[PDB]
Amino acid sequence: ADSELQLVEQRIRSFPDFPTPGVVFRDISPVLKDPASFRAAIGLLARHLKATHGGRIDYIAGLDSRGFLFGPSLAQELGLGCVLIRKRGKLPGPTLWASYSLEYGKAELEIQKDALEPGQRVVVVDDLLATGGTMNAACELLGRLQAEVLECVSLVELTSLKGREKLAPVPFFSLLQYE
Amino acid sequence: ADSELQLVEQRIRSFPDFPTPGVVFRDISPVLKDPASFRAAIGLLARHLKATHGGRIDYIAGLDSRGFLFGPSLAQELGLGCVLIRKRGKLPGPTLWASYSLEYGKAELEIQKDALEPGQRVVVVDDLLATGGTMNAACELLGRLQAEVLECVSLVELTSLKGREKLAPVPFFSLLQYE
Ligand SMILES: Nc1ncnc2c1ncn2[C@@H]1O[C@H](COP(=O)(O)O)[C@@H](O)[C@H]1O
Ligand SMILES: Nc1ncnc2c1ncn2[C@@H]1O[C@H](COP(=O)(O)O)[C@@H](O)[C@H]1O
Ligand SMILES: [Cl-]
Ligand SMILES: [Cl-]
């Protein structure tokens, strides 16, 4: 297409009634499949984070499983490591658990108790923000490790679901906004 | 440590009796957390694939969820796109299903029916090869899309579990070998 944002815009596809009726699933697979689109997405997020936080970011935290697609490249682009926040029963050793029952489903996440040392500054990444249940659970886990969450970011945001509100005062940034 | 392989070697940690008794879990999280280690791992895999297959690779296929950590960066390093092979119930639209009951668990995977066009050449990546049940299920799905699997690769291989044998004649390559 041309601009960096354009290359990301044109690589979302939509599937209605998935996983349940009335829900439009937004699939980032075309972004992964087109190496120009992927690079553009990582570049846009990286440039935002660098302009916004300077050199204050210690780690990116990627959310299982689609956040895992972006976290490592985003971290690498910023010269940083990536830590993992996982779905239930994935992680070995001591962990912290966050289990939220929400109106539309559950957000159940875990993190290794030694994933971060206290005072470390982190940016969370996932593919998509909807209600904010998931990212909110991630911020809870990180705060219980005494990490500071600088910002959460995603490729896609569903604005009618008020995810940004739920996360406030933690800053939020997305590339693309749909209803 | 120093050599590229060294930087990967020193970033595996082990947790015994997880997820079940007698099983040693090999955790690649330290690789992700140390940006030098991650870059070294991607570089080693990329250089092997480039030396081995020339320009014949069309896509990397990453396995959900830990293969997702490496697939995108490996693809990017080779100038290629990454396609996704997912656990059950993740993907929207038409899919192919592979469900294997194995002595020690199940390998249940899915791929979008349009993930690839017939004749496309693919390398599969995951964090770790054990029995080969998972990668074998992935190769089945790719073959049913009439894709050619050039090779499967991983960071870690558990050699006592004969994963390489199970995959043969599909070539296999790992960075690190444990019993
Ligand atoms: N409409 C959607 N399409 C694709 N993924 C979604 C959608 N809604 C929720 N998700 C996934 O669930 C999480 C965001 O939902 P939420 O916790 O409500 O913010 C992310 O991990 C998304 O990948
Ligand atoms: N001992 C292990 N430590 C970490 N992951 C494992 C281990 N064994 C199996 N896996 C995971 O399960 C898959 C490989 O098991 P297999 O299908 O038996 O080759 C990969 O997705 C691995 O991430
Ligand atoms: Cl995982
Ligand atoms: Cl997924």
CA nearest neighbour of B71 among A35, A41, A127, A128: A35
How many Å apart are CA B61 and CA B123, to the nearest integer? 6
Active site amino acids of A:
66, 103
Residue showing tokens 């990668």: B135
CA nearest neighbour of B30 among B6, B11, B43: B11
Is B86 near ligand 2, meaning CB less than 6 Å away? no
How many Å apart are CA B175 and CA B101, to the nearest integer? 28
- A86 to chain B: closest CA residue: B65
CA nearest neighbour of A72 among B71, B150, B69, B154: B69
Whether the ω angle into residue A169 lies within 30 degrees of 0, i.e. cis, is yes
Is B126 near ligand 2, meaning CB less than 6 Å away? yes
Helix (H, G, I), strand (E, B) or coil at B176: strand
Ligand minimally distant from the alpha carbon of residue B89: 4
Are A132 and A164 within 8 A, CB to CB?
yes
CA nearest neighbour of A60 among A162, A138, A128: A138
Q: What long-range pairs does A112-120 form, CB within 8 A, spacing at least 24?
A: A112/A84, A112/B29, A113/A145, A115/A83, A115/A84, A115/A145, A115/B29, A116/A58, A116/A59, A116/A83, A116/A142, A116/A145, A116/A147, A118/A145, A118/A146, A118/A147, A119/A146, A119/A147, A119/A148, A120/A58, A120/A59, A120/A145, A120/A147, A120/A148
Helix (H, G, I), strand (E, B) or coil at A21: coil
Are A101 and A39 within 8 A, CB to CB?
no
Which candidate from A39, A65, A80 shows the least CB-CB separation from B68? A65
At position B129, the amino acid (one-letter code) is L
CA nearest neighbour of B61 among B109, B97, B94: B109
How many Å apart are CA B153 and CA A9, to the nearest integer? 32
Ramachandran region, residue A35 (left: φ > 0; alpha: ψ -120 to 50; beta: rest): alpha
Rg (C-alpha) for chain A, rounded Å, is 16
CA distances from A97 to A119, A145, B64 (A): 20, 11, 22
How many Å apart are CA B17 and CA A1, to the nearest integer? 51
CA of B21 to the centre of ligand 1 (A): 34
Query: How far is residue B16 CA from its own chain's centroid?
Result: 22
How do B172-178 and B148-158 pair as beta strands?
parallel
Contacts of B175 (CB under 8 A, 6+ apart): B5, B8, B41, B44, B45, B154, B155, B156
The residue contributing the CA closest to ligand 2 atom 3 is B25
- A81 to chain B: closest CA residue: B33
CA of B144 to the centre of ligand 2 (A): 23
Both tokens of B165, joined, read 């044998």
A34 touches chain B (CB under 8 A): yes
Both tokens of A96, joined, read 């912290």
Helix (H, G, I), strand (E, B) or coil at B20: coil
What stretches of chain B show up as alpha helix (H) in DSSP? 4-9, 29-33, 35-53, 71-77, 133-144, 163-167
Which of B77, B84, B110 is the mutation pick for testing A, counting most A CBs within 10 A? Answer: B84
Ligand minimally distant from the alpha carbon of residue B155: 2
Q: Which residues line ligand 1 (CB under 6 A)?
A: A 23-26, 63, 66, 107, 126-134, 163
At position A80, the amino acid (one-letter code) is L
CB atoms inside a 10 Å sphere around CB B76: 21
CA nearest neighbour of A156 among A133, A127, A116, A136: A127
How many Å apart are CA A36 and CA A8, to the nearest integer? 9
Is B73 near ligand 2, meaning CB less than 6 Å away? no
Both tokens of A106, joined, read 């559950």
Experimentally, how was this structure solved?
X-ray
Both tokens of A66, joined, read 């689609």
What are the two backbone dihedrals, phi and then psi, of residue A63, each rounded to the nearest 5 degrees?
Answer: -90, 130
Are B145 and B166 within 8 A, CB to CB?
no
SS3 annotation, A130-164: CCCHHHHHHHHHHHHCCCEEEEEEEEEEEHHHCHH
Which of B12, B27, B31, B69 is the mutation pick for testing A, counting most A CBs within 10 A? Answer: B69
* Exposure class string for A18-34: b at 16+ Cβ within 10 A, else e: eeeeeeebbbbbebbbb
Are A101 and A91 within 8 A, CB to CB?
no
Dihedral in degrees, nearest 10, Cα atoms B171, B76, B46, B86? -30
The answer to whether residue B66 is catalytic is yes
Query: How far is residue B117 CA from its own chain's centroid?
Result: 21
Is B164 near ligand 2, meaning CB less than 6 Å away? no
Work out which ligand 2 atom sits closest to the CA atom of B63: 21
At position A13, the amino acid (one-letter code) is R
Domains of chain B, first to last: 1-179 (3.40.50.2020)
Contacts of A117 (CB under 8 A, 6+ apart): none
Are B67 and B87 within 8 A, CB to CB?
no
The answer to whether residue B13 is catalytic is no
CA nearest neighbour of B112 among B135, B159, B145: B145
Is B155 near ligand 2, meaning CB less than 6 Å away? no
Both tokens of A67, joined, read 């956040």
How many Å apart are CA A136 and CA A102, to the nearest integer? 11
Query: How far is residue A179 CA from its own chain's centroid?
Result: 18
Helix (H, G, I), strand (E, B) or coil at A120: coil
How many Å apart are CA B85 and CA B141, to the nearest integer? 9
CA distances from A28 to A8, A39, A89, B32, B125 (A): 9, 13, 25, 22, 19
